[PDB]
Design a binder for this molecule. Structure first.
Ligand SMILES: *[C@@H]1O[C@H](CO)[C@@H](O[C@@H]2O[C@H](CO)[C@@H](O)[C@H](O)[C@H]2NC(C)=O)[C@H](O)[C@H]1NC(C)=O
Ligand SMILES: *[C@@H]1O[C@H](CO)[C@@H](O)[C@H](O)[C@H]1NC(C)=O
Ligand SMILES: *[C@@H]1O[C@H](CO)[C@@H](O)[C@H](O)[C@H]1NC(C)=O
Lengths: 90, 22, 49
């Protein structure tokens, strides 16, 4: 298992995709994997060692080019919307 | 007044603090 | 007297807004409508069509 790194995962046939992190929520002993309001998985109990892992989607967002007029200049800026710079270079 | 399947929300340009200041 | 009426009326706004849960029903309706729209959009992914 890999934490804090965006990795394809498959738990008992979940076949999801996203980064898995350590979670605080406590499942009941029989409760296999979590869910959200919109019926999208947002947690999973690790089957080997019984711990709850909060899964979150791989970071995505529009990339916009803040540029002045091409007649004024050719130097541009880039915005990576709703993402932290640590994973920007990827 | 009171996760992502490809859906993104964008922040208002005038944040809540600047809206309140306006 | 006008000043007292105005201030007490403002206190009435505060009390009515706090006590009545339907004071902000318009903006809360807008937010709930957007939430229902997005939730239905997500649920449409679960649909076979
Ligand atoms: C086989 O599965 C069992 C149960 O899931 C694992 O048992 C663990 O064993 C380690 C030491 O090897 C202990 O520290 C853990 O407490 C045990 N339990 C859990 C839930 O992890 C066992 O390691 C597995 N074997 C292999 C080779 O993966
Ligand atoms: C860019 O600026 C130059 C210099 O003022 C002007 O000649 C040109 O028309 C401008 N281009 C546009 C697209 O407005
Ligand atoms: C980037 O920002 C998030 C959200 O504020 C923060 O929790 C996180 O620690 C940052 N990422 C890293 C890898 O430090």
């Amino acid at each position: 298992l890999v934490k804090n790194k965006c990795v394809n995962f498959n738990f008992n046939g979940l076949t999801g995709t996203g980064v898995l992190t350590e979670s605080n929520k406590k499942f009941l002993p029989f409760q296999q994997f979590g869910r959200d309001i919109a019926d999208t998985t947002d947690a999973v109990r690790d089957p080997q060692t019984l711990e709850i892992l909060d899964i979150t989607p791989c970071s995505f967002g529009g990339v916009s080019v803040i540029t002045p007029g091409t007649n004024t200049s050719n130097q541009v800026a880039v915005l990576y919307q709703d993402v932290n710079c640590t994973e920007v270079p990827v | 007044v009171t996760k992502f399947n490809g859906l993104t929300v964008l922040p208002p340009l005038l944040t809540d603090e600047m809206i309140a200041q306006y | 007297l006008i000043a007292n009426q105005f201030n007490s009326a403002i206190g009435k706004i505060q009390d009515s807004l706090s006590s009545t849960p339907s004071a902000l029903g318009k903006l809360q309706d807008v937010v709930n409508q957007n939430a229902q729209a997005l939730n239905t959009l997500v649920k449409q992914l679960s649909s076979n069509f």
